[PDB]
Paper text:
The microscopic openings across the walls of many capillaries contain a protein mesh that is formed by the extracellular domain (ECD) of plasmalemma vesicle-associated protein (PLVAP). Current evidence suggests that a single transmembrane protein, plasmalemma vesicle-associated protein (PLVAP or PV1), constitutes the diaphragm’s sole structural protein. PLVAP is a type II transmembrane protein of ~60 kDa with an ~390-amino acid C-terminal extracellular domain (ECD), a single transmembrane domain, and a 26-amino acid N-terminal cytoplasmic domain. The three-dimensional structure of PLVAP CC1 presented here shows that it forms a parallel disulfide-bonded dimeric coiled coil.
PLVAP CC1 contains five cysteines and one methionine, and previous studies have demonstrated that SAD from sulfur-containing residues—sulfur SAD—can be used for experimental phasing and structure determination. For this experiment, we first screened additional crystallization conditions and obtained PLVAP CC1 crystals in the P212121 space group with unit-cell parameters 35.6 Å, 86.2 Å, and 181.6 Å, referred to hereafter as crystal form I. We then collected data at a wavelength of 1.77 Å, using a low-noise and fast readout EIGER X detector, with an exposure time of 0.015 s per 0.2° oscillation. The data collection encompassed a total rotation of 1,800° while continuously advancing the crystal 300 μm. Constraints related to the detector-to-crystal distance and the long wavelength of the X-ray beam limited the resolution of the sulfur SAD data to 2.4 Å. The structure of PLVAP CC1, determined from crystal form I by sulfur SAD, reveals a parallel dimer with five symmetric interchain disulfide bonds (SS-1 by Cys142, SS-2 by Cys153, SS-3 by Cys178, SS-4 by Cys199, and SS-5 by Cys224). The five disulfide bonds were confirmed in the anomalous difference map. The electron density for residues 141 to 145 of crystal form II chain B was not visible. Structure-based analysis by the Socket2 algorithm for both crystal forms shows that most of the PLVAP CC1 dimer exhibits a classical coiled-coil configuration characterized by heptad repeats (abcdefg in Fig. 6A). Among PLVAP CC1 dimers, the average rmsds are 1.15 Å for crystal form I chain A + B vs. chain C + D, 0.89 Å for crystal form I chain A + B vs. crystal form II chain A + B, and 0.84 Å for crystal form I chain C + D vs. crystal form II chain A + B. Conformational differences are greatest at the N terminus.
Residue numbers in the entry:
A (entry chain A): 0 to 88
B (entry chain B): 1 to 88
């Protein structure tokens, strides 16, 4: 075993070994990111759906109010025509 | 530098083979992150657009029930005015 063979054996895996540690850190970082994105997505979707449900309920109520205001108008209009036709016999 | 080079070769080959196996894990996870972010943002955009259209419908319905009330006031005012000219 030469002294230059020994120096080479000491150095051969250094960058490979240092990369192994860095890849462990990257795996952990990516596993946390997957878990976080999945949790934030579902939370955001729930808020959007809740906001949308509230607007749909308001649209339903407005629509029903619109049907009963067009109902009353038809009655008032006929009463007005009746009074105008029978006015001054 | 005789059997030393064959030693340097086998030790690095073992280390490099482990690095590439672990590297398959990183690549798999990067693709999963990219896929989920694309599906999530696309779905969020559709939900927000759908919400924006229902609000516009609620705004239009509200403006239509404002026109109906104003026209009901017009009919009631005409009825009140014509009643003063006609016997009940």
């Amino acid at each position: 075993t030469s002294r230059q063979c020994q120096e080479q054996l000491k150095e051969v895996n250094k960058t490979c070994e240092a990369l192994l540690f860095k890849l462990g850190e990257k795996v952990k970082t990516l596993e946390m990111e997957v878990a976080k994105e999945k949790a934030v997505c579902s939370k955001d979707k729930e808020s959007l759906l809740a906001g949308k449900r509230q607007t749909e309920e308001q649209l339903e109520a407005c629509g029903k109010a619109r049907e009963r205001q067009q109902q009353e108008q038809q009655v008032t209009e006929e009463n007005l025509r009746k009074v105008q036709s029978l006015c001054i016999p």
